Structures are given as C-alpha cells and as structure tokens.
Amino acid sequence: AGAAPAGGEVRRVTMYAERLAGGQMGYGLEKGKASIPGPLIELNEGDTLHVEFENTMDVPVSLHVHGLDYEISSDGTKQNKSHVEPGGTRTYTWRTHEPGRRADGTWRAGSAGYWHYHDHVVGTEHGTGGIRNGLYGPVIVRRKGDVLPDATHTIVFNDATINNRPAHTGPNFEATVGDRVEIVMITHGEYYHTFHMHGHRWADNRTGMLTGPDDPSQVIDNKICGPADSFGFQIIAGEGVGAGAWMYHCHVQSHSDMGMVGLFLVKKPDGTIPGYDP
Amino acid sequence: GAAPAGGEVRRVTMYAERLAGGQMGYGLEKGKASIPGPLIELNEGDTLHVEFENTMDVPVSLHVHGLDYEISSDGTKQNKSHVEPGGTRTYTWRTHEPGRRADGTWRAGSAGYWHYHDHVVGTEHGTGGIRNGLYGPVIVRRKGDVLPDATHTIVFNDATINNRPAHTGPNFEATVGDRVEIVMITHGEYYHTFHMHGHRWADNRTGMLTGPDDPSQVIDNKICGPADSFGFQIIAGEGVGAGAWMYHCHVQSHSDMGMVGLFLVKKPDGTIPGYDP
Amino acid sequence: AGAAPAGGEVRRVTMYAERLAGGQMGYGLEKGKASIPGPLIELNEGDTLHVEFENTMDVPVSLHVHGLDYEISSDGTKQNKSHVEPGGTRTYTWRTHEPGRRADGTWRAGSAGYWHYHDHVVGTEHGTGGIRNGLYGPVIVRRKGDVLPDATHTIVFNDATINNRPAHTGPNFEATVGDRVEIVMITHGEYYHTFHMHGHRWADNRTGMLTGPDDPSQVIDNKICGPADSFGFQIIAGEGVGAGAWMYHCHVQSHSDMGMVGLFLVKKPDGTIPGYDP
Ligand SMILES: [Cu+2]
Ligand SMILES: [Cu+2]
Ligand SMILES: [Cu+2]
Ligand SMILES: [Cu+2]
Ligand SMILES: [Cu+2]
Ligand SMILES: [Cu+2]
Ligand SMILES: [Cu+2]
Ligand SMILES: [Cu+2]
Ligand SMILES: [Cu+2]
Ligand SMILES: [Cu+2]
Ligand code: NA
C-alpha cells in the first residue's frame, strides 16, 4: 500500500451548511451537494486547512473540530462569536503539527488521529439540534509513513441511528477480499454504544494497527463509545475468514434489535458473496 | 508456566440446554450446562472443531468474538448458520499468530480475552438467548504468555452477575501469592464499571505491563458495555495481604441492587482476617 | 519543569468528615475546612500515608481509596468494620510501591497514577448517599522522574453535576499561555459521561503524555468515563492555539445543555483573555 507523506501544505476548500429533506442539515464541499455524514477531510501532520464556510440556512450554524489546532476565532461557538450568521460566510482555519521533542525534553504529541467536526450552536449552545439534524463529519490526520487504505468508510452512531438513516437501512459497505479498508467511527447525541464487527478485529490504539511485536494494545472486535468519541482502524477485508456478508452493529441488544446494524459485504474476486441472499 | 506454541487441531462437544427458571446454558456434556458456559482455552494457531448439539425446542446458535471463522460458522440466521431444534452442526474456530505481512505491516494475532454467545434466541441478535444465559469465555494465549494458578469468569449480564440472583456473589477463593486470572465479559443493555478492592491491573492485552516501557494506564475500575471482554492476572494479596476483597460494579444503583461479590484471599494457614459473613 | 523524586517517606495527615450546607458532606484536612472535592493528596511511589481520620458527623462515614496499597483493615467498609462511627477516630493507612520485576519474572505495576478516595457507608453500604453528598477527593501518585505541573485542577462528574455545583456554574480554571496544567478527572454516581476539552488534547495513557515516538496510545480530546473511573493528564495551556476561554464539558448532549460546562480561561501574559467578558 501507499504511505502518507510529510505534511506542510496550505490547502483551502469551500464548505456549505445546507438544509436537507425531513428537517435534516448537512455539510458539503459544493453547493447543493451536502451529505450526512459530511465530507471526509484528510490532512497530513503539518498541513493547514482554510475552510471558506458559507451558511445557506436561516439559522446560525458553526463548525467545531476535534483534535486539530485552531485559534479561539475558529472554535465555532457563540461564546467567542465564531459562529456564522444566516447567509453569512467565514474562514475557519485548522492547523496540524508533527510530534517532537520540546526544548525541555518532553515529547509533544502530534495531531495525527481519527477526528471529526460538527455544529456547536444550532438548537442549543452545544449544537444539540445541529448534531441531531446531521451536521457532523469525519477528519483524518495522518502521520508521515502511516499506511494508506484502498477505501475509507465512516460510521456515525448518532442517537439511535447510523448516519441519520431510517432504522434497518444500513449503510452497507462493499469490499473485495484482501482490500485494505479503513473505518472511521464517530458517536454523537445522548447514548453510549458498543461497536462490533463480525469476522474482523483491530488494535485499540491510534491507528488501529499494532506497531510491531512490542505494542501491548488490546486487540478487540467490540468497543464502547459515547457522544463525540472518535476512533478508526484498518482491516484487511476477509483476512483469515474469507468472503461473506459480515455484520457490523451496535451490540447494545435493544439497539441492534431496533436497526443499528449494517453489512460489510466482502466479495470474492468474481464479485460474489457466498451465502448472501438479499 | 508459560503457554506453548499452538497449532493443534482440537475437538470438543458442546450442547445448548434448557436450565431451570427459563434459563439456557452451554455445556461440554449432556446435563452439565452452566452459566457462564465452559471456559475454552486455545494457543495461537490452534483450530477448534465444536461439535455442537441443540437439545432445546427452539433454534440456537454459537457466535464467537475475536477468533477466525468462515461465514459458515458466524452463528447467525442471516447466514443460515444457526442450529434447528434437536439439530447438530460443527462450528470451526481458527486462530493465528501475529506476523509481518508481505506489504510490511504487522498482522495482529488472535491472542486475547474473548467470548461466545447465542445470536438467534428471541431475536436475530440473540437478545433472549444472551439474557437466558447462553454465553461463555474464550481465552487465546500467545506463545510465552504467563499461565495462572486459577481462572475466574465474571459476566455482567444486564443487572446480574453470571445470571445469579441479586446479592449472591459469586465468590472466588485464593491464597496470598496465587496468580489469579480474571475474565470479564459484559452483555445486555447497560454499561457497567468493574471495580476490585485491593488489586489493580494494566489496561492492555494481558492485564500485565510488559516491562518498564509499557505506558498503559494502571487501573482498578473499568467501564464496559455489551459484548466487551477483557482480562487480567493479579497476584492475590500482593502488597495488601489476606482478606475478603470485594469486587462489584461501581455504578451506584447496580452495586446497591447486588452486583457484588468477594475475592476471598487466605493466608497459607487458611485464615482470612476479620472475615465474618 | 520539575520532576518527581523517588518516594519512600512516611507521611501523616489529619482528615475530617463534616456536614456542609444543604445536606452536603465533605472531607477536609482541618476542622471547618471541608471542601467538595476533598483535598488533593499527592504522594511519590514508595511513600506511606497515615490518615488520622475523624468523623464529626452524626452518621457513620468511611474512607475508601482506589489504586493504592492498603490492608483489609483500611478497606473503609462496614463489611470489614473499617468504617468510623459518629464522633469516632481511626487511622487509615495507604502505602505505595515502585514498579519492579517480581521473583517470578513478571513486571509488577507501580502505584503511580490518577486515583481518588470516597465514602463507602453513607446511605448504602456502597456509599451512594455519601458520594452524592460530596464525600470524594483526588489522589495523585507520581513516579520518579514524572514531570511536575504548574497547577493541578480536579474535575469530578458526579451524577449530572460538576463538583456538586449547581448547573451552569462551572467551575472555571485560570492559567497563562504556556503554563503546564494538570487535570484530574473523576466520575461518580449513576451515569456515564464523555469529558471534552476545547483547544487541547492528551494521550490516553498513564500520564496523559506520550513517552516518545514509540508510544502508540491514541491522542484524544474526548473520553468516555463511568462511576469511579479516574484519569489525568497534563497540557501546555494554549499550546499551538493561543489564549482564550476554552470550554470543557461533558459531551452527552443533554448533560452539556443542562449545565455540565466550564471554562479553561487561558490568559495572555498581560492577563487578558481575547473574546471573553467577565
Ligand atoms: Cu464543546
Ligand atoms: Cu447503540
Ligand atoms: Cu460478534
Ligand atoms: Cu465536540
Ligand atoms: Cu452480531
Ligand atoms: Cu453495572
Ligand atoms: Cu457478540
Ligand atoms: Cu467498593
Ligand atoms: Cu455527562
Ligand atoms: Cu470506589
Ligand atoms: Na493503550
């Protein structure tokens, strides 16, 4: 696979907050193309991102990001008046940094990780309405040399839904046996959850992959998460287990019974999935 | 002692059976089902063929966490890998050692504290079967892992421990200095926090720090949710001595309602100072 | 910055349990000086601490500690008769130890970490009433060479309150940009929470700081916690982000909405906070 390069680029992108059907709200990079979850933003440590933001809605909205470097003017809260008025525009700036030794000998942690952005002002001063309506999305910051995946899928447990979809409607994600598949897992709202994936497992650390034989991180296939938690991992699709419709679901029993389930559809090279009859 | 390299093909018979009071359990022999079900121990590289029989009048399945299995041993109705009433099926579990892939990455091995449970009784996620007692622990050891003097399994199933009536333990006994392994599994609807008085462990794969370079937090209290599993080994009474050492869920209403038990640590002469039930 | 020395001192302190206003109860080091959270106790690995304890209330109380070494006679439970009757006195003894290789060849974990003490007998035999009333406090055990902070702040999520405070009353904590600030985070009661801090992040490990480039711990700014969980970390105030009123809060949406929120007030050297009014 590929490997992430050293960062240091200054990038710019447009983002819009838009109303969607059914009282929903989403972010998008192009006007009229908002989505829930919002678009995946990927940066290498050291990169700067200027987000030229426009609120197309009739209510104030904001952009608050986890983990990355931002000044108080990009906090995205009413507290420091860094929200965006209806119809207004604003440049949010996110920075990231590499890890390194401070002059005093301590080690500064870098920005790399699985992160997310979301609204902080719709409905309440903590964005309860905006988050419920769909204003959230994933952010990945990569360290130089991190392994790059063939595909990235984002799964958000928001209240009792996955990605604000109606119960029992996935999402499903497709891969071929051997694909290096990255999962970004974000939780929002009111409830705790446990994320479980059949047939696969990952390391409970920054990258979801063990660094080598000396990494003592627990290897897991089930993880408890609460509102605004984010983690991610990579798996080799079907590794040691073969093709199939591999369930993922919240493992809180009533949540899985009510439709917080989806399928990791791992196909053979001929594109078929043994035993899978929809 | 230490765990050997795995690679054996092992076989075991397992039965799902009704127990008293609407409960259900797994067992290795007919009539000896238990809650939790039997402890299954493997070394990385071992294969296990579970020759499974459903003795009940409703369908049941066997779904395992962590281990390698093909979709035909998923243990779900969706993949048609459940067991009809009176039926039999061989579930196959495989395990593997860690190793460097061709692309240069490190493949994580199977070693860890895992568990198996039903996936079809009551609902297509086994909500009824899990509630009824259809769960059990699996340990997969890596070559060189330290072996314990005893292993005890503690399952927080909804507001119960091991499906026992409230305020009824279970209790476990050890002597000061014993190396005691705890397997901790959670099931059902609720989050919990597992706490043990007088003892502590490392929040990592084995529950023990690998040495002075391991940065894992050392804890005596751990949040867990449905289908979480973890485990650890402690030295009974290490630095604290003999006594009736409580363990309990630390969610206050849960400990109040009876999610509590005792780790009875005896001196070599058998005495437990001040213990008076 | 400073570094913790090797421990091994026999230390002594008096502690009192007292009623406070409005049905609350607290621990203090001197009579009339009980606080919620109770006083911060700091030890170096190897130190022994003798707590000369006195119950000044009209109901039995106890003192139970997490993480530290104690004999069964200092368990602090009525079950073992290590509670304190009204007006009674008792000496609770806590010990700590350095890590080291056992005779059996395995590595014995040291006492170092972020811990806490609390009541175990008020209301119920698990201290539900006493904890609810305010009988809890932080304990920090440092390892030789641990980095010492400029200030330490304790944040306890107790049911749906912070430090038993009325909703929407903080607490707030002040620092200057560049300060090395230590946060002790304890959870009590009935609910799970997720602790989030704007503008800052830490490592999910013992110290909250990565040991160096080989530490694979996830770097986070959001962490799920349940009753009797404790963790801590150090941050450099405003590092890479600047001065400002930086929010911290539980991220469970109804909890933040109903006032489990405070401010990390990071000042410029002149003492001002950009974008914030008192
Ligand atoms: Cu916030
Ligand atoms: Cu859920
Ligand atoms: Cu599973
Ligand atoms: Cu947030
Ligand atoms: Cu499942
Ligand atoms: Cu519980
Ligand atoms: Cu499961
Ligand atoms: Cu207790
Ligand atoms: Cu909360
Ligand atoms: Cu406690
Ligand atoms: Na870890």
Residue numbers in the entry:
A (entry chain A), C (entry chain B): 40 to 317
B (entry chain C): 41 to 317
Study text:
Laccases (EC 1.10.3.2) are multi-copper oxidases that catalyze the oxidation of various organic and inorganic molecules (e.g., mono- and di-phenols, polyphenols, diamines, aminophenols, aromatic or aliphatic amines) with the reduction of molecular oxygen to water. Substrate oxidation occurs near the Cu1 ion (named T1 center), and electrons are then transferred via the Cys-His pathway to the Cu2 and Cu3α-Cu3β (TNC), where the reduction of oxygen to water takes place. 2D laccases are homotrimeric proteins, with Cu1 ions of monomers lying in one plane at an equal distance from each other and forming the so-called equilateral triangle.
Based on our structural analysis, we propose that the side chains of Met 199 and Tyr 230 can hinder the access of organic substrates to Cu1 ion. Supporting this suggestion, we observed that substitution of Met 199 or Tyr 230 to residues with short side chains (Gly, Ala) led to an improvement in rate of catalysis (kcat), which represents an increase in the availability of the Cu1 for organic substrates (ABTS and 2.6-DMP). In particular, the Met199Ala mutation nearly doubled the SgfSL activity toward ABTS and 2.6-DMP, and substitution of Met 199 to Gly increased activity of the enzyme toward both organic substrates approximately by 5-fold. Met199Gly and Met199Ala mutations led to a shift of pHopt for 2.6-DMP oxidation by 1.0 point, while Tyr230Ala mutation shifted the pHopt by 0.5 points. The residual activity of the Met199Ala variant after high-temperature incubation was approximately the same as SgfSLwt, but the Topt of ABTS oxidation decreased by 10 °C. As the residual activity of SgfSL due to Met199Ala mutation did not change, the substitution did not affect the mobility of the Cu1 ion environment. At the same time, Met199Ala mutation influenced the Topt of ABTS oxidation, likely due to increased substrate dissociation from the SBP at high temperature.
